[PDB]
C-alpha cells in the first residue's frame, strides 16, 4: 500500500498546476468584474425592437432552435445588472495542470425580477437569458476595446458542456493581463437565481414545452441553471469536513480523460457527461450515506486512495440506470432505492434535479465496466497497477478502444432528405431537442435491437460536431450542416461479444396461438427478413437467417439491414478497414472455404480426428516397451498455425506436426547418447514396419533432425494419413533429460555456456513444448479471437523477414498479452482490434528494463502469486545485472511454464529484436498521422527491403499455392516419395544454413512461407541480408576474423561482398535470378 | 509505399 | 592486385568464380600456410583460411590436380582434416557423456598430403599461382562451386533408405553391448592395487569411468557445551 501512497504522491505534484499562473488570472477576471459592473442597464423590450438593437450590431443573440416568432414572442426582454460570482472546479481549488488548457467558469445570476413564475414554460426563460448574453457581449466588446485588451482577446460563443439550449461566452487569450501562458480561459455561464421556478414542476417526468411527453432534458437544463451555486456550497463543506476531498477529486479527474469521459453532452452521441462535478458530487452524497440502510460507505477520515476505491467500487456493483436509483440532499442520509428508472439517475430531494440526465444508458454501461475492471485491478496485489489505470491514454484511437467502427452516410449531406426530416416530426421535439440528439438515439436502439446479444456495448458518434461559434451568427454552422445539422457523418462504434457474435441465427419469440407483442415487434422490426422454423429440440420460434462469410463478419450484414430499413434506405454503411485484415488471413482450399467464418476451427478439428485414428493403431500395437502416451505437440493442434491444415497439402511447411512419443520407463536405455538415439530410431522402425504391413492404406518415411545442436543422430518417422494428413513422430526418454544434464557437468568451463544452449533448445522442444500447447489449447477456447489474430501476426513478421529468427512460441507467447493481460483495454472481440493492441503492445514494450511475464490463466487456480511474481523479477534483473544493454538477450517471455524467461526467446540478433519493435513503433506513428484506411493496412503489410544492405530474388521452378492449401492442387501423394522434394520451397532451410557460415558477418533473413507472401503465383522468394558494422570497414588479418575478405594491403582486408554473392548463387542454383546490392 | 524503419543495432531506438 | 603473400607469412591463393546470369572476373581468394606440427595426423598438412562454400577433398584433388599439370609438380593430397563449415563437429558429444564408443579456430582447415615431397611440390607451386594474380589474372584457376558431396547436400528433403539405416543401427547396438559387457565384468572382476588394497565396487555398476566421475563430483552435534569443570566456570563467568 505504501507504494501506491507515494505513487499518488508523486502524480499529484507532476500535475500540480503552478500558483505563479493562478496569480495571473485573478489579477485578470478580478479586473474583468469591474468591466461586467460597468455595463449599464437596459429597459423593457419586446422581440420585435431588440431585432432593430442587434439588426446592424456585429453581434447576433444566440437564439436556441425554436427560435421566438412574432406571434408566440409577446414576452418583453430586459437586462439588469448580474450577481458576479465564481463557480466550477476552479472555485474549489481542486483543477490541475493540463496541456490542452483549463476553463474558469464564472456565473452571472440574472435578477429575480427579470422572470415571471412560469417563465420555465416553452422555453420563455431561455429567451430572456438569451438576449441578456447578447447584451452582455455587446457591451463588453465596446468595452474590452476602451480600455485595449481586445488586441490579445478574442470572444466567440459556445455551448455549456455541448448542451445547445445553454450558449455561453467563450473568452481566451492569443498570444500585462495577458494569461495565454496560463492556459486558462473564463467561461461566462448565465445562470438563474436559486428556486425562480418551482422545482417540483421541473421534474424529469413533468413537462415543460406544451404540444403530453415528459422533457428530461430540458427540465433538467434550466433547474440546473438555477442550481449552481448550491452545489457550490454542498461540495465547500464536503471539502472542510473531509482533508483529502480536492486529492480524491484530482484522482477521479485523471481517471476519466484516460478512459475518455468527460461531462459534456452524451445525447448528442460523444462519450462523456461524467466530469469532476458528476465525480465529486457522488463523493459527498456517500460520505453522506449511500447504503440500502442509509449507513455510510465512505467515512471522512478515508484517504485519498480509500475515497476513490469505494466509488469504483461502488460505481461497479450497484446499478444506477435500470434496477435501482440513488437520492441524496444536498441542503437526509443518501439512501439506496431499488427501484430504478430506466435510465442514469442519482436523484437530489434538495433541489429535485437528477444530475445524471446528461448520461444516455448506453455510456453508463460502458461507464460501469471501466469501473469494475479497475476495482479488479485496484483489488490486485501481485501486480502494480498504477501506471495502467492513471497513466494510459485509452481513448487515442477508437479502434483500439472498440471492437468495430462502421460510419454511416446520411443522405443529402445541403439539409436531410425530407423523409428523414418528417421522421423526427414534431412528438420528439419536445422529447429530443435536437436532430442530432433524435438521430442518434434512434440508431442505438435499432442497432442494439438488431445485434441483441452479439454485442456488449454500443456507442454512437456524431463525427465532426463542433461546440462554438462566432458571435455573429447565431448558431453553430456545420460545413455539411448548412445551419441544419451540426455533423458530418455519424460513426457506429461496437464492443462485440465473441461467444454469440457469428451465430447464423438471431433468436426471437417462440410461437403461441396469439401473436404476442414480443413477437410482433420481432416480425415487424426484421420484415421480410423474419420467418418461424423449427429445430431438432421441436421448439417453434420465430427467426431470421445470416450467411458467414470469410471476409465479413455477421455484425456488418446485420448493421446495414437494420439500418437501412428503419432509419433511411438511401444511407451508405461501410466497414472496409476490417474487411482487409480478413482477407490478409489466407482462405484455405476446403469446402466452402469462402462462406467459412474466421472464428471456426473445423480445419484443426479434423485434423485432430485423423490424428486419433492413428492413435489408436499405435497403443494396439504390441512392442518391446508399452507406450506410456502420445502427445501431439503440432502448431495446429493448438490453433495458430498460419494456413489451416488442407488435406494432401503438403507444400504447407507446417504440414507435417510435431508428435512426442515417450514409452514406459525402462533401465535397459543406453547410457551413451548416440546409442540412446539409435535405440529411440529402432522403435520407430519397428513401429514404420507393422504400421506397414497391419495398415498399408498409412504410407510413412523416416528423417533426419538437426534443431538441437551437435545431436546430428535424430531420426524422426513422418506418417501421410489416409485422410492427407502429415505427422512426425519422434520419442522421448527420461534419461534422455539427465544426459544432457551430464552433458554440461563434464564440459570445460569454456564450453558450458555452448552445452546449455543445446539442453535448452531440447527443453523446449520436448519438455516445455507439451505444456505450451497444452495450456494454449484450453486458453485459446475463451478467447475466441486470439485464434485468428495470432495467425496474422504470424502473417505480418513473414512479410517483413522476422520469422526466420522468431520461434514460433515467441510470437504466439507475445500475440497473448492483450488477453491475459488487457488492462488498461478490454479483451479485443475483432481482428483488427487485437492485432492492432498487439503492435501497440510492442511498440511501447521497452525489453531492457521492464519483463514480460504473463498469467497463461482463462479469464475470472493456476495465477502468480506474490512469491512466485517476485521470483521472476528477480530472475530479470539478475539477467540484466550480467547483460545491462540487452545484446545477448532481449525479450524477457516468463510464465508458469517458464519461468526462466530465456526459453523462447534466445539466440535471436539483436537488429532483428530492434528491427521488431521499430516498425510498430512506425506503424502505431502511422496510425496516428493517417487515420486506419485501405491505403494505411497495405502500408503496414508489405516490406521496404531498402534498408537491407543486399536483396536476393529468388522464384521457384513451380508454384506453390496450390500444394500449400491456400485459395486464389494435389489430391492424393505422391507413389514415389522423392517426388515430395520436387514441390517444396527450400528458401527457409537455406537461409537458416548460411547464417551459421556467416553468423559472425551476416544475417541473412528470407520468407518462410512463400505460398502466401510470394506474390500471386506464390513462387517468388526473397533473402535479405546485413553486413556489421565490424567487417563493413576494412580489418586487419587475423586467424580469428572468420570470415571470406580479400586483401587490401599487406596487413589489411575487406568484405568479399560479391564472393558471397556467389556462394549464395551457386548454393541457390535454378532458384535465384536477381542480386541488389 | 513501405513500412521502412531504420536498422538499429545499438539498441538506441528503445 | 599486386599482393602476393601476407608478412605473417599467408600466401593468397585467387580463384575465378564461376559465370552465373544472377551474378554478371569476379574472385574468390584462400590464404595458407605450411602447418608445423609434431602429431602425426597433422604432419603434413597445409594450413587453409577462407575456404569456399562445402569444401570437400575432392575439391582440393581438382585444385592440386590442376596446379601438378600447369607445374609438371607431383602432388596427391591425403585428407583434409578440421572442414566444418557450419561447426556441426566442434563439440564431441558421444565422448563427454562416456568413453564407451568414444574415446576422445573457424572457417579454416588442415590440407593433409601423402608425403613430405608433395607439400613442397604444392607450395612452390602455391607461390607461382600467386605471381600469376598481379601479372596475368586471366589464367587463374576457376572454382566449379559443384561435387556429387553438394548434390547430396543440396537435395535436403531426401527420405534416407530404410535398408542402410537396419545395417547401421545393428552394427552400432552390438558394438555398445560388447564394449558395455566388458565394463561391467572390469568393475566387478575384484580390483587389486599392488598394495593389496580391494577396491570396492557397488551392486549394477558398470563402468569405472563412473566410479572415477564420482570421486571427482563429490562430532559438532555431539559436541556438549557443558560437560567438563572449566566449560560451567566459563558458564558462571558469562552467568555473572
Redesign the interface.
Known amino acids: 500500500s505504501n507504494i501506491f501512497k507515494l505513487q499518488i504522491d508523486e502524480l499529484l505534484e507532476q500535475v500540480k498546476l503552478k500558483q505563479k499562473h493562478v496569480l495571473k488570472v485573478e489579477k485578470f477576471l478580478h479586473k474583468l468584474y469591474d468591466i461586467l459592473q460597468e455595463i449599464p442597464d437596459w429597459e423593457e423590450k419586446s422581440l420585435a425592437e431588440v431585432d432593430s438593437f442587434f439588426k446592424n450590431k456585429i453581434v447576433s443573440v444566440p437564439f436556441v432552435d425554436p427560435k421566438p416568432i412574432p406571434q408566440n414572442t409577446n414576452y418583453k426582454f430586459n437586462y439588469k445588472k448580474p450577481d458576479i460570482s465564481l463557480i466550477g472546479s476552479f472555485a474549489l481549488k481542486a483543477g490541475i495542470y493540463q496541456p490542452n488548457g483549463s476553463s474558469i467558469d464564472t456565473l452571472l445570476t440574472m435578477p429575480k425580477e427579470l422572470f415571471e413564475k412560469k417563465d420555465f414554460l416553452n422555453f420563455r426563460c431561455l429567451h430572456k437569458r438569451s438576449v441578456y448574453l447578447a447584451y452582455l457581449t455587446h457591451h463588453l466588446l465596446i468595452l474590452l476595446k476602451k480600455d485595449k485588451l481586445d488586441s490579445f482577446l478574442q470572444l466567440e460563443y459556445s455551448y455549456f458542456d455541448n448542451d445547445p439550449l445553454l450558449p455561453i461566452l467563450r473568452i481566451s487569450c492569443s498570444k500585462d493581463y495577458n494569461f495565454y501562458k496560463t492556459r486558462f480561459s473564463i467561461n461566462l455561464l448565465i445562470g438563474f437565481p436559486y428556486k425562480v421556478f418551482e422545482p417540483k414542476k421541473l421534474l424529469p417526468n413533468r413537462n415543460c414545452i406544451r404540444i403530453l411527453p415528459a422533457t428530461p432534458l430540458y427540465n433538467f437544463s434550466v433547474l440546473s441553471s438555477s442550481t449552481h451555486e448550491n452545489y457550490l456550497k454542498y461540495l465547500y463543506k464536503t471539502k472542510k469536513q473531509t482533508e483529502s476531498f480536492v486529492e480524491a477529486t484530482v484522482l477521479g479527474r485523471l481517471w476519466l480523460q484516460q478512459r475518455g469521459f468527460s461531462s459534456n453532452m452524451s445525447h448528442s452521441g460523444s462519450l462523456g457527461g461524467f466530469g469532476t462535478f458528476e465525480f465529486t458530487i457522488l463523493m459527498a452524497a456517500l460520505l453522506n450515506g449511500g447504503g440500502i440502510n442509509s449507513n455510510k460507505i465512505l467515512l471522512h477520515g478515508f484517504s485519498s486512495y480509500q475515497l476513490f476505491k469505494g466509488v469504483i467500487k461502488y460505481l461497479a456493483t450497484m446499478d444506477l440506470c435500470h434496477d435501482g436509483h440513488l437520492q441524496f440532499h444536498s441542503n437526509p442520509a443518501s439512501k439506496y432505492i431499488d427501484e430504478g428508472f430506466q435510465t442514469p439517475t442519482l436523484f437530489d430531494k434538495s433541489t429535485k434535479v437528477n444530475i445524471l440526465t446528461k448520461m444516455t444508458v448506453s455510456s453508463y454501461q460502458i461507464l460501469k465496466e471501466y469501473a469494475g475492471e479497475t476495482l479488479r485491478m485496484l483489488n490486485n496485489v501481485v501486480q502494480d497497477q498504477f501506471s495502467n489505470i492513471f497513466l494510459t491514454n485509452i481513448s487515442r484511437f477508437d479502434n483500439l478502444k472498440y471492437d468495430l467502427c462502421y460510419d454511416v452516410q446520411l443522405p443529402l449531406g445541403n439539409n436531410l432528405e425530407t423523409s428523414l426530416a418528417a421522421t423526427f416530426g414534431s412528438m420528439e421535439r419536445v422529447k429530443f431537442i435536437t436532430l442530432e440528439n433524435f438521430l442518434a438515439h434512434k440508431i442505438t436502439n435499432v442497432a442494439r435491437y438488431a445485434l441483441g446479444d452479439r454485442i456488449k456495448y454500443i456507442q454512437i458518434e456524431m463525427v465532426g460536431q463542433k461546440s462554438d461559434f462566432p458571435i455573429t451568427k447565431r448558431k453553430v454552422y456545420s460545413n455539411t450542416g448548412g445551419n441544419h445539422f451540426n455533423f458530418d457523418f455519424v460513426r457506429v462504434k461496437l464492443i462485440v461479444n465473441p461467444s454469440e457474435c457469428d451465430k447464423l441465427v438471431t433468436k426471437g419469440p417462440a410461437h403461441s396461438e396469439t401473436m404476442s407483442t414480443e413477437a410482433a415487434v420481432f416480425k415487424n422490426f426484421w420484415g421480410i427478413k423474419s420467418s418461424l422454423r423449427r429445430f431438432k429440440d421441436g421448439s417453434i420460434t420465430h427467426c431470421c437467417v445470416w450467411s458467414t462469410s470469410s471476409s465479413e463478419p455477421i455484425i456488418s450484414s446485420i448493421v446495414n439491414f437494420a439500418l437501412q430499413k428503419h432509419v433511411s434506405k438511401k444511407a451508405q454503411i461501410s466497414n472496409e478497414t476490417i474487411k482487409k485484415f480478413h482477407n490478409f488471413l489466407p482462405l484455405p482450399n476446403l469446402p466452402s472455404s469462402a462462406k467459412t467464418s474466421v472464428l471456426n476451427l473445423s480445419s484443426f478439428f479434423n485434423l485432430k480426428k485423423s490424428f486419433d485414428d492413428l492413435y489408436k493403431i499405435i497403443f494396439q500395437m504390441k512392442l518391446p516397451l508399452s507406450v506410456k502416451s502420445i502427445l501431439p505437440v503440432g502448431s495446429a493442434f493448438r490453433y495458430t498455425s498460419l494456413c489451416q491444415p488442407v488435406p494432401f497439402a503438403y507444400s504447407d511447411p507446417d504440414f507435417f506436426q510435431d508428435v512426442i512419443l515417450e514409452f514406459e520407463t525402462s533401465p535397459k536405455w ?6 540412446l538415439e ?2 529411440k ?2 522403435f520407430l ?1 519397428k513401429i ?1 514396419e507393422e504400421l506397414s504391413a497391419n495398415s498399408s492404406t498409412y504410407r510413412s ?4 533432425d ?1 534443431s538441437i ?4 543422430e535424430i ?1 524422426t518417422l513422418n506418417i501421410l494419413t489416409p485422410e492427407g494428413y502429415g505427422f512426425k513422430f519422434r520419442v522421448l526418454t527420461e534419461r534422455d533429460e539427465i ?1 544432457y544434464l ?2 554440461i ?3 570445460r568451463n569454456e ?1 558450458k555456456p ?2 546449455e544452449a543445446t539442453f535448452l533448445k531440447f527443453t523446449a522442444k520436448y519438455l516445455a513444448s507439451v505444456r505450451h500447447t497444452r495450456t494454449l489449447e484450453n486458453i485459446s477456447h475463451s478467447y475466441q479471437f486470439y485464434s485468428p489474430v495470432v495467425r496474422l501476426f504470424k502473417r505480418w513478421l513473414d512479410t517483413h523477414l522476422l520469422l526466420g529468427h522468431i520461434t514460433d512460441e515467441l510470437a504466439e507467447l507475445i500475440a497473448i498479452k492483450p488477453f491475459v493481460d488487457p488492462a488498461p483495454y478490454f479483451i479485443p472481440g475483432s481482428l483488427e482490434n487485437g492485432f492492432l493492441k498487439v503492435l501497440k503492445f510492442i511498440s511501447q514494450w521497452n525489453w531492457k528494463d521492464d519483463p514480460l511475464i504473463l498469467d497463461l490463466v482463462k479469464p475470472e487456480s493456476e495465477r502468480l502469486t506474490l512469491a512466485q511474481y517476485k521470483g521472476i523479477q528477480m530472475n530479470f534483473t539478475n539477467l540484466r545485472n550480467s547483460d545491462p544493454n540487452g545484446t545477448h538477450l532481449q525479450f524477457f517471455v516468463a510464465s508458469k511454464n517458464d519461468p526462466s524467461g530465456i526459453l523462447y526467446s534466445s539466440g535471436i540478433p539483436l537488429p532483428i529484436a530492434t528491427r521488431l519493435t521499430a516498425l510498430a513503433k512506425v506503424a502505431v506513428n502511422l496510425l496516428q498521422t493517417h487515420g486506419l484506411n485501405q491505403q494505411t493496412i497495405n502500408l503496414l503489410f508489405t516490406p521496404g527491403l531498402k534498408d537491407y544492405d543486399f536483396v ?1 530474388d529468388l522464384r521457384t521452378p513451380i508454384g506453390l499455392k496450390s500444394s500449400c492449401g491456400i485459395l486464389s492442387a494435389p489430391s492424393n501423394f505422391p507413389e514415389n ?2 517426388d ?2 520436387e514441390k ?1 520451397d ?1 528458401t527457409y ?1 537455406l537461409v537458416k ?1 548460411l547464417n ?2 556467416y553468423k ?1 558477418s551476416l544475417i541473412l533473413s528470407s520468407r518462410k512461407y512463400i505460398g502466401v507472401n510470394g506474390g500471386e503465383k506464390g513462387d517468388k522468394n526473397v533473402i535479405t541480408g546485413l553486413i556489421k558494422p565490424l567487417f563493413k570497414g576494412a580489418h586487419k ?1 587475423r ?9 587490401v ?3 589489411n582486408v575487406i568484405l ?1 561482398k ?2 558471397i ?3 549464395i ?5 535454378d532458384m ?4 541488389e546490392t | 509505399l513501405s513500412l521502412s524503419a531504420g536498422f538499429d543495432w545499438t539498441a538506441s531506438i528503445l | 592486385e599486386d ?1 602476393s603473400a ?3 607469412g ?1 600466401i ?1 591463393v585467387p580463384f575465378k ?2 559465370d ?4 554478371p572476373a ?4 584462400m ?1 595458407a600456410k605450411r602447418h608445423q606440427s609434431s602429431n602425426s595426423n597433422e604432419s603434413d598438412c597445409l594450413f587453409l ?2 575456404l ?2 562445402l569444401s570437400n577433398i575432392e575439391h582440393m584433388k581438382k585444385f592440386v590436380g590442376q596446379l601438378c599439370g600447369k607445374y609438371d609438380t607431383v602432388s596427391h593430397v591425403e585428407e583434409l582434416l578440421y572442414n566444418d ?7 564431441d ?2 565422448a ?3 568413453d ?3 574415446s576422445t ?4 582447415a588442415l590440407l593433409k598430403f601423402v608425403d613430405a615431397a608433395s607439400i613442397n611440390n604444392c607450395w612452390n607451386a602455391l607461390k607461382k599461382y600467386s605471381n600469376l594474380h598481379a601479372k596475368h589474372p586471366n589464367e587463374l584457376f576457376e572454382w566449379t ?2 561435387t556429387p558431396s553438394f548434390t547430396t547436400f ?7 533408405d ?1 535398408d542402410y ?2 545395417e ?2 545393428h552394427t ?2 552390438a558394438i ?1 553391448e560388447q564394449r ?1 559387457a566388458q565394463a561391467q565384468e572390469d568393475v566387478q572382476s575384484s580390483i587389486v592395487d599392488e598394495d593389496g588394497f580391494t577396491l570396492v565396487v557397488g551392486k549394477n555398476t ?1 563402468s569405472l569411468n563412473s566410479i572415477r ?1 564420482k570421486i571427482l ?1 563429490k562430532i559438532d552435534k555431539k559436541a556438549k557445551k557443558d560437560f567438563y569443570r572449566f566449560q560451567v566456570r566459563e558458564r558462571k563467568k558469562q552467568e555473572i
Open positions: 543406453p547410457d551413451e547418447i548416440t546409442s539409435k535405440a530410431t529402432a522402425l514404420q518415411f523416416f528423417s533426419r538437426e545442436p551437435y545431436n546430428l531420426v544426459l551430464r552433458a557437468a563434464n564440459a564450453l555452448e552445452l536476393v516419395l522423392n515430395l522434394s517444396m527450400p532451410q544454413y551459421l557460415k559472425n588479418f586467424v580469428n576474423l572468420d570470415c571470406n575478405v580479400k586483401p594491403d599487406d596487413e568479399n560479391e564472393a554473392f556467389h556462394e548463387a551457386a548454393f541457390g542454383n535465384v535470378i536477381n542480386f | 599482393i601476407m608478412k605473417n599467408f593468397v568464380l564461376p552465373h546470369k544472377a551474378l569476379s574472385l574468390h581468394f590464404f583460411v577462407n569456399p562454400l563449415e557450419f561447426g556441426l563437429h566442434e563439440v558429444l558421444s563427454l557423456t562416456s564407451l564408443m568414444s579456430p573457424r572457417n579454416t562451386y559443384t543440396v537435395n535436403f528433403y531426401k527420405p534416407l530404410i539405416l537396419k547401421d543401427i552400432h547396438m555398445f558395455e558398470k566421475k563430483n
